[PDB]
Amino acid sequence: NLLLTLTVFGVILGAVCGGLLRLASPIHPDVVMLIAFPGDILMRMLKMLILPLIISSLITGLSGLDGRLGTRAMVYYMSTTIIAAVLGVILVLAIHPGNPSSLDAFLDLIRNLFPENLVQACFQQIQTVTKIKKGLEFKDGMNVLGLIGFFIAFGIAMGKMGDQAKLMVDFFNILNEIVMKLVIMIMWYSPLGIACLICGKIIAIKDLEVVARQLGMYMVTVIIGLIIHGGIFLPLIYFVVTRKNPFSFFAGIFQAWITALGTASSAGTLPVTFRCLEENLGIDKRVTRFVLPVGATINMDGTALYEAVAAIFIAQMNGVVLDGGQIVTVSLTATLASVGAASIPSAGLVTMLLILTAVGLPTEDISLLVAVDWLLDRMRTSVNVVGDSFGAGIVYHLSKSE
Amino acid sequence: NLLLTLTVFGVILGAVCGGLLRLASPIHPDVVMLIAFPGDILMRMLKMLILPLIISSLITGLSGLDGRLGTRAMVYYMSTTIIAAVLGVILVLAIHPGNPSSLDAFLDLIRNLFPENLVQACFQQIQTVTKIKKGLEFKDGMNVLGLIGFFIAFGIAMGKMGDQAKLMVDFFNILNEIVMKLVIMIMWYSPLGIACLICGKIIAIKDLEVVARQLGMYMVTVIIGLIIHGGIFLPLIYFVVTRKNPFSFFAGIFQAWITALGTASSAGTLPVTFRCLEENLGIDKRVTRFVLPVGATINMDGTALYEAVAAIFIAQMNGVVLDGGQIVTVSLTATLASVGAASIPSAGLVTMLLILTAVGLPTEDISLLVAVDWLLDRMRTSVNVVGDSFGAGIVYHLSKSE
Amino acid sequence: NLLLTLTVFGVILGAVCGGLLRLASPIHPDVVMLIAFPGDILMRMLKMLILPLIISSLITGLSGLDGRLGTRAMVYYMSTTIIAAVLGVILVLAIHPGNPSSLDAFLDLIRNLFPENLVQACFQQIQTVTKIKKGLEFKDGMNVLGLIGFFIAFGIAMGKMGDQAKLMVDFFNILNEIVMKLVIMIMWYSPLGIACLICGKIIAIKDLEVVARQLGMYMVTVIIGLIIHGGIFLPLIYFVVTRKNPFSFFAGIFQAWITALGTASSAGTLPVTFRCLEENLGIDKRVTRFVLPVGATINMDGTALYEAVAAIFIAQMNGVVLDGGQIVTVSLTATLASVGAASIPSAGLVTMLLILTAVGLPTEDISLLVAVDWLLDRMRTSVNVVGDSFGAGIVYHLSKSE
Numbered sequence A, B, C: 001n002l003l004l005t006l007t008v009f010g011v012i013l014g015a016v017c018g019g020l021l022r023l024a025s026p027i028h029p030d031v032v033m034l035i036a037f038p039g040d041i042l043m044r045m046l047k048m049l050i051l052p053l054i055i056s057s058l059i060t061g062l063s064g065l066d067g068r069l070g071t072r073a074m075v076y077y078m079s080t081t082i083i084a085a086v087l088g089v090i091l092v093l094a095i096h097p098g099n100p101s102s103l104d105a106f107l108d109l110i111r112n113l114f115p116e117n118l119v120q121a122c123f124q125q126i127q128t129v130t131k132i133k134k135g136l137e138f139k140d141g142m143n144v145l146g147l148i149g150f151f152i153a154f155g156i157a158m159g160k161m162g163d164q165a166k167l168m169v170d171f172f173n174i175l176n177e178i179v180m181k182l183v184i185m186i187m188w189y190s191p192l193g194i195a196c197l198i199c200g201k202i203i204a205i206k207d208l209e210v211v212a213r214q215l216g217m218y219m220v221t222v223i224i225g226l227i228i229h230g231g232i233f234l235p236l237i238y239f240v241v242t243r244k245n246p247f248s249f250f251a252g253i254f255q256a257w258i259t260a261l262g263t264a265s266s267a268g269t270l271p272v273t274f275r276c277l278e279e280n281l282g283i284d285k286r287v288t289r290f291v292l293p294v295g296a297t298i299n300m301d302g303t304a305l306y307e308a309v310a311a312i313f314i315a316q317m318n319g320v321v322l323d324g325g326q327i328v329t330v331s332l333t334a335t336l337a338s339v340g341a342a343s344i345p346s347a348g349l350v351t352m353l354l355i356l357t358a359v360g361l362p363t364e365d366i367s368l369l370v371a372v373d374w375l376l377d378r379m380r381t382s383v384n385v386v387g388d389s390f391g392a393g394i395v396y397h398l399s400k401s402e
């Protein structure tokens, strides 16, 4: 992919330039600002497509693209993704890769899920404050959960309406097309932006060793989680429901997992994994003809885990402890973000700002995660492919009523 | 109505549970919070449909559903409703059921009617402040009058456009359908919410007697106003315009008023009141074929009076004196709220938050009003039916040009 | 034009009433407030159509109404308008008609061009603050550049889509029609509003001589700029590109410039200037059949210059020095405002609030500018007509590939 290769070239460049300036001399604060600036603009542009993207995606999907076995597949996907995101959260909290009022927080979480006002939720959200007299107060920051929730309601309502809602459906389809064009164009400007951010981040970092160590630890944490979710959770769930050998199930797909790593894209891995389940496992083409394609765009357990660990890592590196609700916000958004990062084209950096915007984090340290995304990409892709295959086996096993 | 009966069952339950907990022991503040919480969410959900509801209703109505006699009917309706709402206001201020800078307030009222910005008006509104240097400042709280006003302008503008605006009209029709589905679904969750609110309200109340006394006084105040508007104002206006016996006019409709109480629904009272004016009064089927049906969804004088007295009662119980503008805001919103509470299905609790949101009141004490709405419902229904009948007589009398 | 004559009659009236009250006695502050009040409402109404107008105009234009020679015409127009607006800015700063952190300001300018959030930008915008620790902070005031920019992106994206975006295009066309009806209706209420504002402004002014002197100086400044742009810049550019006699080019059009002054409307001047270039200069009817009509609604160099000098004059009279970014905001909005004041019907007062809202100025002193707009209108009209003629010559000269 020209842009993936372009983004990595930009990273290297950005990195080399930052290193050169640092070893050359201590850069003036105003000049570091001007150095990282074209990265600020990359974020500002992407972050300004989040809201329209959330609204069009939710309403275009839940209406436009809505049997029993289909229900089974969706249940497996959502369940596995929530599992993956929760694993991510536990590991990033335990491992703590990033190195720097209980009921009330969850109470606010639940309030922010029903924003008193749609508009205001687009930029701010409710918080509890202690005065020992508690109050609600606004705090800046878009209510991602507030809006996602209400638009889910709205989309499910329209969807039920039927051809009566045709017009509004078509309008929102057009909107989604326009916003996706803009995301594509911005991600084309991304390589420069990422280069500038990395060059700036290096010039600011006080001890390369510490930051290098933290980022490496984050990568291992993402790695560990991909292994546990795919190597243990997926296979165990297979057995618990199928009572069959997960290794026997996995033995056949070896070619499929290989294509997964090889193509680094479920889309390109898709025809091989058709073959591997139809021929080797002998899964009914029906189940194979639905679970595989649907999963290729929504079942992204590896993506969700990466997105949760990354969000708490950025939190941690910024000396910010997330409250119980903020952690639930990460888990909820991480799952949605992965079903998006999978559907929306070149939306890898959009979704990560969505999760960070949702927890109210800096959103600048997103640059470090990019510097290493290219290594973690292979694994996370393969994890997503594996899950879809297990799902097809599970759906087929749970579909013997026939 | 399963839901009306459900809501009353919920009230009783809520009440019994609150009473039990109170007589059992003093509940911890955090636990009372968790008790009333599912009521907080009922409000948060309803209040989040106000804005879309205001926009779709105004634009779908003033465009989609827009002779001389028709003009006459609308004039009578709007006039009588404003009269009913003003009577409500005077009585609630005089009686004062709830028991706890002149020009500037009306000046702000007039400003808030033309919000400098549509978006900002969706969550905040202009106020005057004294520094002896006066200034305008924002104060949180959706500009209900700001938005209603501008959308009235917008809808009247589209309406005139004609079939040219077809598309935009159809789009907003679909929106209105979706938002009404959501209001219906939430009001289904209402019974639990109302029960929780009442249980909490009882646990907090310090002296049951005082609150019981206040709520009873509010009910009598609503009652008195229904009597004065229907028993005096309506009949007097009939004579002043018709110069005929209002008792002679009322004598025939007795059956109609009975059905009104019996069906507790103008809709179910509708065929009887057709009969009562066509047969007994001998009103021309033409006038009867328009005034009755149009009124059955817009002429709600009893509803407007209830909605104004309730709004100032909630104000009063909360030790808040309304300024001259806030009182005008209640009168204006109360009239619109009654034409809505009449059109929008199961919108009894939505409209009351609209009036409270408009005056910027607590919006939680709405629970007490629900506890007694079921008693006042009968009377207010009959008052609305009576007004429509008088209107048909007045329109027919004012339509002898023919 | 009944309304132009009405607006001037209102000015005279307003002025006479203000003068009478002032010579009669010192008016009470509350009564001056009530005097100017119906002007406040004129602004509040107009300013509340800016946002919808910006959105519908940008999306209806850049999509609905989008060869080489056509590209040439647009380049000439945009270039000449930016030149005109910059001349305006320099002159108003130099002459200083109105009589009362470098990089950071431009950095904010560039940020406000990519608002992190669409909604929030509709009412507020980013600023740098010094604590010696710099921060970004919100400051009230709609991000005109933020929204214009993003909608330009959105419209260009839809435009490319093609007939696929038909629906959304038609929807926004309808919206634009509705908003334009409202602007027309408000400008009908303008005469009273302007009269009230002028009556109030006179009653407040402490020294008529000083204010009279300042306004006269502003008029000369607008005059000087119209002369320099039309008398020097336009003709020079003609020669630089054509290497032909600008006087020989101008000699023929004399009749065209006359109609310009005579009709005080490029629209009415349009058939004469067709004649003057086709017959006298002998410009190919093709170029004449495009450059003239397109320019008659977008090439408004005289309008842009007026709008920049006016914006900085209102700034200056209000003892407000504009930062480097605010000046660029004026130049950018002034150009857009002139292409609008030209397209949108009776949008002379809307566009001036847009420029003032963009720089965050009082927006009330707009009354003085109206008091003298009628004199400056003749000249600015003729300047716009002249530019279109020069453009036709330049486009024809640059189009001899043929």
Ligand SMILES: COCC(CCO[C@H]1CC[C@@]2(C)C(=CC[C@H]3[C@@H]4C[C@@H]5O[C@]6(CC[C@@H](C)CO6)[C@@H](C)[C@@H]5[C@@]4(C)CC[C@@H]32)C1)COC
Residues within 6 Å of the ligand: A050, A053, A054, A057, A058, A061, A062, A063, A065, A066, A148, A290, A294, A297, A298, A336, A337, A339, A340, A341, A343, A344, A347, A350, A351, A354
């Ligand atoms: C036979 O197969 C049938 C199948 C049916 C598909 O149904 C759709 C239902 C909604 C769903 C799951 C779909 C696609 C995009 C999904 C969205 C991506 C967006 O991303 C987010 C997060 C990140 C933001 C940047 C944007 O918004 C979410 C809120 C948004 C999202 C998760 C909302 C839900 C959407 C699929 C067809 O599948 C193609």
Ligand SMILES: COCC(CCO[C@H]1CC[C@@]2(C)C(=CC[C@H]3[C@@H]4C[C@@H]5O[C@]6(CC[C@@H](C)CO6)[C@@H](C)[C@@H]5[C@@]4(C)CC[C@@H]32)C1)COC
Residues within 6 Å of the ligand: B050, B053, B054, B057, B058, B061, B062, B063, B065, B066, B148, B290, B294, B297, B298, B336, B337, B339, B340, B341, B343, B344, B347, B350, B351, B354
């Ligand atoms: C022959 O008969 C012809 C007749 C013509 C009807 O014309 C329509 C004109 C607008 C009007 C009066 C109508 C219905 C809903 C009315 C709305 C209910 C909403 O409620 C509110 C307040 C409460 C909020 C929760 C929502 O918004 C208002 C702002 C909204 C409202 C009052 C705006 C005005 C609307 C009727 C047909 O009648 C069916």
Ligand SMILES: COCC(CCO[C@H]1CC[C@@]2(C)C(=CC[C@H]3[C@@H]4C[C@@H]5O[C@]6(CC[C@@H](C)CO6)[C@@H](C)[C@@H]5[C@@]4(C)CC[C@@H]32)C1)COC
Residues within 6 Å of the ligand: C050, C053, C054, C057, C058, C061, C062, C063, C065, C066, C148, C290, C294, C297, C298, C336, C337, C339, C340, C341, C343, C344, C347, C350, C351, C354
């Ligand atoms: C053969 O001829 C072809 C030609 C093609 C025309 O293409 C269109 C492209 C967009 C353009 C330049 C056009 C008309 C209105 C223009 C708008 C007026 C508005 O005014 C503003 C400022 C003032 C505000 C009050 C409203 O918004 C701008 C943001 C808005 C504006 C400048 C955005 C750009 C628009 C012409 C046809 O021409 C008729």
Ligand SMILES: CC(C)CCC[C@@H](C)[C@H]1CC[C@H]2[C@@H]3CC=C4C[C@@H](O)CC[C@]4(C)[C@H]3CC[C@]12C
Residues within 6 Å of the ligand: A002, A006, A010, A188, A189, A190, A191, A192, A193
């Ligand atoms: C100010 C910017 C444009 C300077 C250049 C920065 C680099 C990193 C970026 C920014 C915009 C990018 C281009 C924008 C879009 C395209 C079209 C696509 O089909 C191939 C890649 C190509 C041609 C990109 C190559 C790299 C690019 C030039």
Ligand SMILES: CC(C)CCC[C@@H](C)[C@H]1CC[C@H]2[C@@H]3CC=C4C[C@@H](O)CC[C@]4(C)[C@H]3CC[C@]12C
Residues within 6 Å of the ligand: B002, B006, B010, B188, B189, B190, B191, B192, B193
């Ligand atoms: C958490 C909630 C759901 C617990 C139950 C609370 C009670 C008061 C409410 C909430 C939702 C309600 C249900 C939602 C919708 C319907 C469908 C309708 O056609 C009949 C009533 C029925 C079946 C309602 C009965 C009462 C109900 C169960």
Ligand SMILES: CC(C)CCC[C@@H](C)[C@H]1CC[C@H]2[C@@H]3CC=C4C[C@@H](O)CC[C@]4(C)[C@H]3CC[C@]12C
Residues within 6 Å of the ligand: C002, C006, C010, C188, C189, C190, C191, C192, C193
């Ligand atoms: C409160 C207002 C209405 C008082 C009058 C103020 C004056 C200055 C204004 C306000 C509204 C204006 C009218 C509104 C619209 C029209 C219709 C148009 O085809 C001719 C002019 C005419 C008839 C205007 C004449 C002047 C007018 C009466």
